[PDB]
Amino acid sequence: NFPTIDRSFFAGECFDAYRVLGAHPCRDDFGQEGWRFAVWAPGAVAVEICGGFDGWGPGVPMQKADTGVWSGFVPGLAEGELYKYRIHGKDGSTVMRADPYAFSTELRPGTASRLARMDFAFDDSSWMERRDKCRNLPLNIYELHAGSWKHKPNAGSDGWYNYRELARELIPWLLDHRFTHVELLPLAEHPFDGSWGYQTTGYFSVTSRYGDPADFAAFVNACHRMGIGVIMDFVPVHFAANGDALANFDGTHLYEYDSSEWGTCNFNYYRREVCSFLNSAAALWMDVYHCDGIRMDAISRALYWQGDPNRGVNEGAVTFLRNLNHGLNERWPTGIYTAEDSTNFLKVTAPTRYDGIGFDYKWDMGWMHDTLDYFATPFGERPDAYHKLTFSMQYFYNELYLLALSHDEVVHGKKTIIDKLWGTYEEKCAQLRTLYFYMYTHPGKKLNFMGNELGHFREWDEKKELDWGLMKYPFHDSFQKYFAELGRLYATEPALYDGEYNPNCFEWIACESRDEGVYAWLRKGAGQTILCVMNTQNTAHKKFPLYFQYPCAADELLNSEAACWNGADRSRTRHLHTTDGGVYGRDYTLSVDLPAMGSRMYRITPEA
Ligand SMILES: OC[C@H]1O[C@H](O[C@H]2[C@H](O)[C@@H](O)[C@@H](O[C@H]3[C@H](O)[C@@H](O)[C@@H](O[C@H]4[C@H](O)[C@@H](O)[C@@H](O[C@H]5[C@H](O)[C@@H](O)[C@@H](O[C@H]6[C@H](O)[C@@H](O)[C@@H](O)O[C@@H]6CO)O[C@@H]5CO)O[C@@H]4CO)O[C@@H]3CO)O[C@@H]2CO)[C@H](O)[C@@H](O)[C@@H]1O
Ligand SMILES: OC[C@H]1O[C@H](O[C@H]2[C@H](O)[C@@H](O)[C@@H](O[C@H]3[C@H](O)[C@@H](O)[C@@H](O[C@H]4[C@H](O)[C@@H](O)[C@@H](O[C@H]5[C@H](O)[C@@H](O)[C@@H](O[C@H]6[C@H](O)[C@@H](O)[C@@H](O)O[C@@H]6CO)O[C@@H]5CO)O[C@@H]4CO)O[C@@H]3CO)O[C@@H]2CO)[C@H](O)[C@@H](O)[C@@H]1O
């Protein structure tokens, strides 16, 4: 007696299809220990369970239910044994395939599925009870590729850390830099290291590059024990086009549309069982591996036909994503669900009830493009481009925006963040401190790809670890300490982390200083006040006036050009007070010395 798929599978409403489909340990009706197998292949005329158990011969015939789910049992197989399905397709094709619901796969280039128990010891119930979407908490995400952060000494695909070893090396770095979460590039199994995980073959198969399912579970458990969250990158728009993975699965276009980019195939959201596959693949990370959220790649290529709103909204994709976010929130309401959509056509982070797509956060792609465009601009041209930086706050409250400098910006000849900036080595270093000052003191949660905190010069290559040797240079060593201090201020100051999405918590102080290239604003989270001021010109400003409506003290919290961070400023004054007189409506002046390319943060204490 084989378990039946829940009817919700055929409704596109199943989030636990992996409890039935795939390979599972069980006893047959005669009490014999073995493994049951189930695969959805409704157009297939025959399917065999194949593996080492009969030396990769004819294998075990599966029985087809009128549901199109094939089932079979093999007695006595051990955890770790290899298997595949031989699928006799509607079109007369015969293809040996990885289990699409495999929980483990041999190391690429092998695709054989491995028998795996998915019963993991977690001791993170405390972490799970405390868990939050972080609307009014620090959310400071370290985006990481698991194969190219750090390699094992004296070895780099022989020199990969196991998930357990990676957790041991990574967690202290995250804690030291006040990162709250690691966002992993997709760990679903994939054949090509250089896809970075974005060309997926094994949606349920945590990649064997870095070890076994229990090793990844141990990674997540370790993060949770130390107060670190884990966000999984997820690829629901398209799958790798490999002929023996998901394409033409039953000898018909089953997972893909019955008729565009890369070596990938687009998922058919009008196929209910495909919606259940993707629901279940997202849920796997939350359920089996206790992940704290999902970042969904390339959502604009799902939302719009050919990724172009002018070609029309894909209403099937919109309903799929609304239903996916609904089901993830029903099961894991304190999970964090994110995407991006540079078209700004649909309301990505509005509740589905108000015709939104129901994501928690949206990457602010406009902020990233406009900010980097600005700091790439020659100093002489910045007065004309002044409002390139103020523009972000005109649309900021339209979505729940997350300020992201991701892996996509530091590859393919685009240059690393520091290498994008205009000027001399010294000017690039000074502006990099001010750029991240701006990122951490602009409202919205934060994401940074590994290497941003080192001031990396070399573009990301997944074949190489980060240039850890950069820390032998004062600039890079002091920079990663400065990055940690931004994290500490962000994590500890309610002005910065509380009420980020409340327009009453942000106020411009200097937003017309075009000639000077000076910007100043208040962050006013939780009734506390922090003044943020940055000079983006290559000349200092003496006693730059900032106009206040009330008299106040200002105590320096951060100086981006301090000796501490290899900066050029030696100023000693950290305590300022307003003078009486200013401009119409703002009768008080706080006068601040601004080093060339430098930023300062002040705690504001109003007079009573
Ligand atoms: O002060 C505390 C400090 O003490 C120690 O640092 C000392 C350090 O050990 C010692 O060597 C010296 O540092 C000197 C250095 O020796 C000089 O050569 C000079 O370095 C500058 C260099 O000449 C410039 O070319 C420039 O280097 C850039 C490159 O231009 C970039 O392309 C990039 O190259 C790296 C590349 O991206 C990577 O892929 C990889 O191939 O490695 C390349 C570099 O090896 O980055 C570098 C670095 O930004 O700028 C250099 C200045 O930063 O000047 C150095 C400083 O005087 O003296 C140090 C002070 O005593 C200790 O090791 C530190 O941890 C500690 O913080
Ligand atoms: O209380 C009621 C009151 O409210 C409003 O005014 C207030 C305003 O909302 C508030 O932001 C603040 O204003 C500050 C401002 O935020 C500061 O940044 C600062 O602005 C002065 C700036 O530092 C100076 O450089 C100077 O700006 C220059 C530019 O630097 C030049 O590039 C040039 O730009 C022109 C450009 O060349 C042209 O191509 C074209 O683009 O147009 C530009 C002209 O704007 O010239 C300008 C102007 O010389 O002067 C800036 C001030 O104008 O200081 C501000 C305070 O003075 O406080 C305001 C007062 O409460 C509302 O507008 C008022 O009517 C109302 O009374």
PDB file of N, CA and C in Angstrom, residues 457-523:
ATOM      1  N   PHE A 457      38.938  44.516  -4.452  1.00  0.00           N
ATOM      2  CA  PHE A 457      39.268  45.111  -5.774  1.00  0.00           C
ATOM      3  C   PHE A 457      38.963  44.118  -6.902  1.00  0.00           C
ATOM      4  N   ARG A 458      39.173  42.823  -6.670  1.00  0.00           N
ATOM      5  CA  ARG A 458      39.063  41.775  -7.716  1.00  0.00           C
ATOM      6  C   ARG A 458      37.600  41.357  -7.834  1.00  0.00           C
ATOM      7  N   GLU A 459      37.080  41.276  -9.056  1.00  0.00           N
ATOM      8  CA  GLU A 459      35.685  40.833  -9.290  1.00  0.00           C
ATOM      9  C   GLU A 459      35.504  39.414  -8.755  1.00  0.00           C
ATOM     10  N   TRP A 460      34.279  39.101  -8.354  1.00  0.00           N
ATOM     11  CA  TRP A 460      33.937  37.769  -7.807  1.00  0.00           C
ATOM     12  C   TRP A 460      34.112  36.696  -8.887  1.00  0.00           C
ATOM     13  N   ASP A 461      34.854  35.644  -8.542  1.00  0.00           N
ATOM     14  CA  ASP A 461      35.054  34.425  -9.362  1.00  0.00           C
ATOM     15  C   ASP A 461      34.751  33.226  -8.462  1.00  0.00           C
ATOM     16  N   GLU A 462      33.723  32.436  -8.785  1.00  0.00           N
ATOM     17  CA  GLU A 462      33.279  31.323  -7.903  1.00  0.00           C
ATOM     18  C   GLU A 462      34.374  30.251  -7.784  1.00  0.00           C
ATOM     19  N   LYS A 463      35.400  30.281  -8.645  1.00  0.00           N
ATOM     20  CA  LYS A 463      36.518  29.299  -8.610  1.00  0.00           C
ATOM     21  C   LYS A 463      37.520  29.697  -7.524  1.00  0.00           C
ATOM     22  N   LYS A 464      37.461  30.941  -7.043  1.00  0.00           N
ATOM     23  CA  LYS A 464      38.443  31.504  -6.081  1.00  0.00           C
ATOM     24  C   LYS A 464      37.742  31.848  -4.770  1.00  0.00           C
ATOM     25  N   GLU A 465      38.447  31.734  -3.648  1.00  0.00           N
ATOM     26  CA  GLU A 465      37.976  32.316  -2.366  1.00  0.00           C
ATOM     27  C   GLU A 465      38.225  33.826  -2.406  1.00  0.00           C
ATOM     28  N   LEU A 466      37.657  34.546  -1.445  1.00  0.00           N
ATOM     29  CA  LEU A 466      37.890  35.998  -1.288  1.00  0.00           C
ATOM     30  C   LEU A 466      39.377  36.229  -1.015  1.00  0.00           C
ATOM     31  N   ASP A 467      39.854  37.426  -1.349  1.00  0.00           N
ATOM     32  CA  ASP A 467      41.269  37.832  -1.153  1.00  0.00           C
ATOM     33  C   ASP A 467      41.463  38.204   0.323  1.00  0.00           C
ATOM     34  N   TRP A 468      41.493  37.203   1.204  1.00  0.00           N
ATOM     35  CA  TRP A 468      41.649  37.386   2.672  1.00  0.00           C
ATOM     36  C   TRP A 468      42.979  38.088   2.974  1.00  0.00           C
ATOM     37  N   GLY A 469      43.969  37.930   2.091  1.00  0.00           N
ATOM     38  CA  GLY A 469      45.275  38.615   2.180  1.00  0.00           C
ATOM     39  C   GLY A 469      45.163  40.128   2.090  1.00  0.00           C
ATOM     40  N   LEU A 470      44.029  40.670   1.638  1.00  0.00           N
ATOM     41  CA  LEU A 470      43.822  42.141   1.610  1.00  0.00           C
ATOM     42  C   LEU A 470      44.001  42.711   3.019  1.00  0.00           C
ATOM     43  N   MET A 471      43.739  41.918   4.050  1.00  0.00           N
ATOM     44  CA  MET A 471      43.730  42.425   5.441  1.00  0.00           C
ATOM     45  C   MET A 471      45.161  42.644   5.948  1.00  0.00           C
ATOM     46  N   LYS A 472      46.167  42.250   5.165  1.00  0.00           N
ATOM     47  CA  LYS A 472      47.583  42.621   5.425  1.00  0.00           C
ATOM     48  C   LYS A 472      47.820  44.095   5.053  1.00  0.00           C
ATOM     49  N   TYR A 473      46.889  44.756   4.349  1.00  0.00           N
ATOM     50  CA  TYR A 473      46.956  46.203   4.006  1.00  0.00           C
ATOM     51  C   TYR A 473      46.116  47.012   4.992  1.00  0.00           C
ATOM     52  N   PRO A 474      46.661  48.114   5.567  1.00  0.00           N
ATOM     53  CA  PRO A 474      45.931  48.948   6.519  1.00  0.00           C
ATOM     54  C   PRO A 474      44.544  49.377   6.023  1.00  0.00           C
ATOM     55  N   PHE A 475      44.429  49.791   4.761  1.00  0.00           N
ATOM     56  CA  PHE A 475      43.135  50.267   4.215  1.00  0.00           C
ATOM     57  C   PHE A 475      42.072  49.182   4.428  1.00  0.00           C
ATOM     58  N   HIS A 476      42.334  47.963   3.964  1.00  0.00           N
ATOM     59  CA  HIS A 476      41.329  46.865   3.940  1.00  0.00           C
ATOM     60  C   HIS A 476      41.069  46.372   5.362  1.00  0.00           C
ATOM     61  N   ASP A 477      42.115  46.249   6.174  1.00  0.00           N
ATOM     62  CA  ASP A 477      41.973  45.833   7.591  1.00  0.00           C
ATOM     63  C   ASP A 477      41.111  46.857   8.333  1.00  0.00           C
ATOM     64  N   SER A 478      41.440  48.145   8.241  1.00  0.00           N
ATOM     65  CA  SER A 478      40.670  49.204   8.939  1.00  0.00           C
ATOM     66  C   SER A 478      39.265  49.284   8.326  1.00  0.00           C
ATOM     67  N   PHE A 479      39.123  49.026   7.026  1.00  0.00           N
ATOM     68  CA  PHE A 479      37.806  49.128   6.350  1.00  0.00           C
ATOM     69  C   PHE A 479      36.834  48.076   6.909  1.00  0.00           C
ATOM     70  N   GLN A 480      37.266  46.821   7.063  1.00  0.00           N
ATOM     71  CA  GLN A 480      36.365  45.749   7.568  1.00  0.00           C
ATOM     72  C   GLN A 480      35.989  46.064   9.019  1.00  0.00           C
ATOM     73  N   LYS A 481      36.870  46.716   9.786  1.00  0.00           N
ATOM     74  CA  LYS A 481      36.535  47.180  11.162  1.00  0.00           C
ATOM     75  C   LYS A 481      35.502  48.313  11.101  1.00  0.00           C
ATOM     76  N   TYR A 482      35.644  49.224  10.142  1.00  0.00           N
ATOM     77  CA  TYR A 482      34.691  50.336   9.924  1.00  0.00           C
ATOM     78  C   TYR A 482      33.328  49.738   9.569  1.00  0.00           C
ATOM     79  N   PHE A 483      33.337  48.729   8.702  1.00  0.00           N
ATOM     80  CA  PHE A 483      32.101  48.039   8.244  1.00  0.00           C
ATOM     81  C   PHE A 483      31.395  47.429   9.460  1.00  0.00           C
ATOM     82  N   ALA A 484      32.170  46.833  10.365  1.00  0.00           N
ATOM     83  CA  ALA A 484      31.645  46.233  11.617  1.00  0.00           C
ATOM     84  C   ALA A 484      31.017  47.321  12.494  1.00  0.00           C
ATOM     85  N   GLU A 485      31.644  48.493  12.559  1.00  0.00           N
ATOM     86  CA  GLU A 485      31.147  49.638  13.361  1.00  0.00           C
ATOM     87  C   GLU A 485      29.824  50.154  12.777  1.00  0.00           C
ATOM     88  N   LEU A 486      29.694  50.268  11.453  1.00  0.00           N
ATOM     89  CA  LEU A 486      28.389  50.624  10.831  1.00  0.00           C
ATOM     90  C   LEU A 486      27.329  49.608  11.279  1.00  0.00           C
ATOM     91  N   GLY A 487      27.660  48.318  11.215  1.00  0.00           N
ATOM     92  CA  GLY A 487      26.777  47.236  11.676  1.00  0.00           C
ATOM     93  C   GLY A 487      26.402  47.401  13.135  1.00  0.00           C
ATOM     94  N   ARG A 488      27.368  47.765  13.979  1.00  0.00           N
ATOM     95  CA  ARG A 488      27.134  47.903  15.439  1.00  0.00           C
ATOM     96  C   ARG A 488      26.174  49.073  15.672  1.00  0.00           C
ATOM     97  N   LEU A 489      26.428  50.215  15.035  1.00  0.00           N
ATOM     98  CA  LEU A 489      25.558  51.404  15.192  1.00  0.00           C
ATOM     99  C   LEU A 489      24.153  51.063  14.700  1.00  0.00           C
ATOM    100  N   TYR A 490      24.049  50.413  13.549  1.00  0.00           N
ATOM    101  CA  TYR A 490      22.739  50.044  12.963  1.00  0.00           C
ATOM    102  C   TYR A 490      21.984  49.116  13.924  1.00  0.00           C
ATOM    103  N   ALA A 491      22.680  48.162  14.538  1.00  0.00           N
ATOM    104  CA  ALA A 491      22.061  47.106  15.372  1.00  0.00           C
ATOM    105  C   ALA A 491      21.665  47.652  16.747  1.00  0.00           C
ATOM    106  N   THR A 492      22.254  48.761  17.204  1.00  0.00           N
ATOM    107  CA  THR A 492      22.110  49.232  18.609  1.00  0.00           C
ATOM    108  C   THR A 492      21.320  50.541  18.697  1.00  0.00           C
ATOM    109  N   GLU A 493      21.136  51.276  17.598  1.00  0.00           N
ATOM    110  CA  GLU A 493      20.515  52.628  17.627  1.00  0.00           C
ATOM    111  C   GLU A 493      19.082  52.537  17.117  1.00  0.00           C
ATOM    112  N   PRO A 494      18.072  52.648  18.006  1.00  0.00           N
ATOM    113  CA  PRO A 494      16.678  52.622  17.574  1.00  0.00           C
ATOM    114  C   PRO A 494      16.374  53.667  16.491  1.00  0.00           C
ATOM    115  N   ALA A 495      17.044  54.823  16.522  1.00  0.00           N
ATOM    116  CA  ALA A 495      16.855  55.872  15.495  1.00  0.00           C
ATOM    117  C   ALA A 495      17.039  55.259  14.100  1.00  0.00           C
ATOM    118  N   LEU A 496      17.949  54.294  13.960  1.00  0.00           N
ATOM    119  CA  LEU A 496      18.343  53.721  12.648  1.00  0.00           C
ATOM    120  C   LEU A 496      17.534  52.462  12.292  1.00  0.00           C
ATOM    121  N   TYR A 497      17.128  51.620  13.246  1.00  0.00           N
ATOM    122  CA  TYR A 497      16.521  50.297  12.913  1.00  0.00           C
ATOM    123  C   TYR A 497      15.012  50.277  13.177  1.00  0.00           C
ATOM    124  N   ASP A 498      14.491  51.216  13.971  1.00  0.00           N
ATOM    125  CA  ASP A 498      13.062  51.224  14.379  1.00  0.00           C
ATOM    126  C   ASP A 498      12.333  52.252  13.507  1.00  0.00           C
ATOM    127  N   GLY A 499      11.200  51.894  12.910  1.00  0.00           N
ATOM    128  CA  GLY A 499      10.395  52.860  12.139  1.00  0.00           C
ATOM    129  C   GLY A 499      11.062  53.251  10.835  1.00  0.00           C
ATOM    130  N   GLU A 500      11.905  52.383  10.269  1.00  0.00           N
ATOM    131  CA  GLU A 500      12.574  52.685   8.976  1.00  0.00           C
ATOM    132  C   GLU A 500      11.524  52.934   7.888  1.00  0.00           C
ATOM    133  N   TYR A 501      10.365  52.275   7.970  1.00  0.00           N
ATOM    134  CA  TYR A 501       9.319  52.358   6.918  1.00  0.00           C
ATOM    135  C   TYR A 501       8.242  53.372   7.303  1.00  0.00           C
ATOM    136  N   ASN A 502       8.488  54.135   8.369  1.00  0.00           N
ATOM    137  CA  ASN A 502       7.587  55.210   8.849  1.00  0.00           C
ATOM    138  C   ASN A 502       8.116  56.538   8.320  1.00  0.00           C
ATOM    139  N   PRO A 503       7.406  57.230   7.401  1.00  0.00           N
ATOM    140  CA  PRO A 503       7.913  58.486   6.846  1.00  0.00           C
ATOM    141  C   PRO A 503       8.144  59.574   7.911  1.00  0.00           C
ATOM    142  N   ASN A 504       7.491  59.468   9.072  1.00  0.00           N
ATOM    143  CA  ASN A 504       7.654  60.438  10.188  1.00  0.00           C
ATOM    144  C   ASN A 504       9.022  60.269  10.858  1.00  0.00           C
ATOM    145  N   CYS A 505       9.766  59.207  10.537  1.00  0.00           N
ATOM    146  CA  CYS A 505      11.082  58.909  11.158  1.00  0.00           C
ATOM    147  C   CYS A 505      12.240  59.391  10.276  1.00  0.00           C
ATOM    148  N   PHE A 506      11.964  59.984   9.115  1.00  0.00           N
ATOM    149  CA  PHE A 506      13.010  60.545   8.222  1.00  0.00           C
ATOM    150  C   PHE A 506      12.715  62.023   7.987  1.00  0.00           C
ATOM    151  N   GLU A 507      13.742  62.860   8.059  1.00  0.00           N
ATOM    152  CA  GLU A 507      13.606  64.309   7.770  1.00  0.00           C
ATOM    153  C   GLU A 507      14.880  64.833   7.105  1.00  0.00           C
ATOM    154  N   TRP A 508      14.769  65.444   5.919  1.00  0.00           N
ATOM    155  CA  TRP A 508      15.903  66.150   5.275  1.00  0.00           C
ATOM    156  C   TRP A 508      16.285  67.364   6.128  1.00  0.00           C
ATOM    157  N   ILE A 509      17.586  67.601   6.276  1.00  0.00           N
ATOM    158  CA  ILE A 509      18.174  68.807   6.933  1.00  0.00           C
ATOM    159  C   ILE A 509      18.869  69.671   5.877  1.00  0.00           C
ATOM    160  N   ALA A 510      19.670  69.056   5.008  1.00  0.00           N
ATOM    161  CA  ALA A 510      20.344  69.713   3.867  1.00  0.00           C
ATOM    162  C   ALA A 510      20.091  68.865   2.623  1.00  0.00           C
ATOM    163  N   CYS A 511      19.230  69.349   1.724  1.00  0.00           N
ATOM    164  CA  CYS A 511      18.837  68.605   0.504  1.00  0.00           C
ATOM    165  C   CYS A 511      18.798  69.529  -0.714  1.00  0.00           C
ATOM    166  N   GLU A 512      19.492  70.672  -0.669  1.00  0.00           N
ATOM    167  CA  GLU A 512      19.622  71.598  -1.828  1.00  0.00           C
ATOM    168  C   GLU A 512      21.062  72.110  -1.960  1.00  0.00           C
ATOM    169  N   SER A 513      22.037  71.469  -1.305  1.00  0.00           N
ATOM    170  CA  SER A 513      23.455  71.921  -1.251  1.00  0.00           C
ATOM    171  C   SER A 513      24.229  71.369  -2.451  1.00  0.00           C
ATOM    172  N   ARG A 514      23.807  71.749  -3.660  1.00  0.00           N
ATOM    173  CA  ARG A 514      24.312  71.180  -4.935  1.00  0.00           C
ATOM    174  C   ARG A 514      25.793  71.522  -5.112  1.00  0.00           C
ATOM    175  N   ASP A 515      26.184  72.789  -4.939  1.00  0.00           N
ATOM    176  CA  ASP A 515      27.587  73.219  -5.163  1.00  0.00           C
ATOM    177  C   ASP A 515      28.508  72.451  -4.211  1.00  0.00           C
ATOM    178  N   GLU A 516      28.080  72.271  -2.956  1.00  0.00           N
ATOM    179  CA  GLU A 516      28.903  71.653  -1.885  1.00  0.00           C
ATOM    180  C   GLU A 516      28.859  70.122  -1.971  1.00  0.00           C
ATOM    181  N   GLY A 517      27.829  69.548  -2.597  1.00  0.00           N
ATOM    182  CA  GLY A 517      27.662  68.084  -2.652  1.00  0.00           C
ATOM    183  C   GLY A 517      27.388  67.517  -1.268  1.00  0.00           C
ATOM    184  N   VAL A 518      26.756  68.312  -0.414  1.00  0.00           N
ATOM    185  CA  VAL A 518      26.449  67.929   0.992  1.00  0.00           C
ATOM    186  C   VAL A 518      24.987  67.502   1.086  1.00  0.00           C
ATOM    187  N   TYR A 519      24.758  66.390   1.778  1.00  0.00           N
ATOM    188  CA  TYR A 519      23.416  65.865   2.103  1.00  0.00           C
ATOM    189  C   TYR A 519      23.372  65.650   3.611  1.00  0.00           C
ATOM    190  N   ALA A 520      22.272  66.031   4.240  1.00  0.00           N
ATOM    191  CA  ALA A 520      22.074  65.810   5.689  1.00  0.00           C
ATOM    192  C   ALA A 520      20.613  65.476   5.965  1.00  0.00           C
ATOM    193  N   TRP A 521      20.393  64.556   6.894  1.00  0.00           N
ATOM    194  CA  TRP A 521      19.032  64.127   7.267  1.00  0.00           C
ATOM    195  C   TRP A 521      19.035  63.650   8.718  1.00  0.00           C
ATOM    196  N   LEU A 522      17.848  63.629   9.304  1.00  0.00           N
ATOM    197  CA  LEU A 522      17.592  62.994  10.616  1.00  0.00           C
ATOM    198  C   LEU A 522      17.004  61.600  10.397  1.00  0.00           C
ATOM    199  N   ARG A 523      17.447  60.658  11.226  1.00  0.00           N
ATOM    200  CA  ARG A 523      16.770  59.363  11.465  1.00  0.00           C
ATOM    201  C   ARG A 523      16.166  59.449  12.864  1.00  0.00           C
TER     202      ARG A 523
END
